[PDB]
Each structure stands twice: as C-alpha cells, then as structure tokens.
Amino acid sequence: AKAKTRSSRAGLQFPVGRVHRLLRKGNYSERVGAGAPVYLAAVLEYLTAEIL
DNA sequence: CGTACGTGCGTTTAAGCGGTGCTAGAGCTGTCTACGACCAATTGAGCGGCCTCGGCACCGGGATGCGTTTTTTTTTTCGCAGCGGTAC
Ligand SMILES: [Cl-]
Ligand SMILES: [K+]
Numbered sequence: 001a002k003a004k005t006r007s008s009r010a011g012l013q014f015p016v017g018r019v020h021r022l023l024r025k026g027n028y029s030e031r032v033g034a035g036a037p038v039y040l041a042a043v044l045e046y047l048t049a050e051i052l
Numbered sequence: 053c054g055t056a057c058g059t060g061c062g063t064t065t066a067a068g069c070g071g072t073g074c075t076a077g078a079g080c081t082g083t084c085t086a087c088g089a090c091c092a093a094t095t096g097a098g099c100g101g102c103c104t105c106g107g108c109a110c111c112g113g114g115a116t117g118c119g120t121t122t123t124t125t126t127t128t129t130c131g132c133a134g135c136g137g138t139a140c
C-alpha cells in the first residue's frame with residue numbers, strides 16, 4: 001500500500017520515474033532496463049549540480 | 053638582409069611481399085532465467101492560480117583611478133665662446 005518514489009530509492013532529486021517514461025515514449029528502444037532511468041537521472045542531477 | 057628550406061646524389065633502412073605455422077577469439081547454436089512489458093487500481097507528486105516583500109535596476113552625487121595635454125624638470129648630448137696650463 002505505501003509507495004516510495006524510485007528517485008528516493010536511489011537518493012536522487014531527479015525523477016527516475018519521468019526519465020523511465022520519457023525513454024519508453026522517446027522511441028529510443030523497444031525495451032528499457034529498470035536501472036537505466038536511475039543511471040540517467042543520476043548523471044543528469046550530477047551535471048545539473050556541477051554547473052549550479 | 054639573413055637564413056631556412058628545396059633539390060639531388062649518395063648511404064642506411066626496413067617496408068613490402070608471399071608464404072608458412074599456431075591459436076585467440078568471433079560469432080553461431082540451443083537451453084532456461086531473469087527481467088521487463090502489460091494491466092489494473094490506487095495514490096500523492098507536480099502543475100497552474102493567487103498573493104507578498106526583497107533583490108535588483110535605477111538614479112543622482114561624490115570618489116578613485118586612468119588618459120590626455122602640456123608644463124617643469126632631469127638627464128643626456130652637442131656646439132660656441134670662454135677658460136688655465138703649454139711653449140717659447
Ligand atoms: Cl537496467
Ligand atoms: K575470428
């Protein structure tokens with residue numbers, strides 16, 4: 001019943017959920033692994049901080 | 053005006069070739085596992101309205117430093133007449 005947001009499970013502020021959707025609806029591939037969005041929201045957050 | 057390329061002829065090298073010998077590693081087949089797509093339902097994260105108050109652009113009014121001229125000086129750099137010692 002209690003739904004923790006994946007972004008929390010990675011300790012990322014970047015939305016690992018919205019990254020997963022954007023990828024599947026991006027037409028990048030047929031199938032997205034479940035680590036991929038994590039890995040990507042991570043890298044995104046990181047470069048966001050590096051500039052900020 | 054100075055010099056560092058360019059040509060070319062002469063030595064040094066090692067690339068290229070064709071063939072031979074050994075073996076990693078490419079790249080396929082079959083099997084089976086784990087992982088991810090799909091669905092449904094349930095949520096709260098995230099978005100479009102409101103309503104401040106404070107960070108920012110502004111403004112005018114001196115203050116610091118930066119460039120221009122042009123005035124006064126310091127240092128160097130010839131040139132003319134006015135010396136002190138030779139010479140006799
Ligand atoms: Cl993955
Ligand atoms: K091979």
Ligand SMILES: [K+]
Nearest residue numbers: 084085086087
């Ligand atoms: K597998």
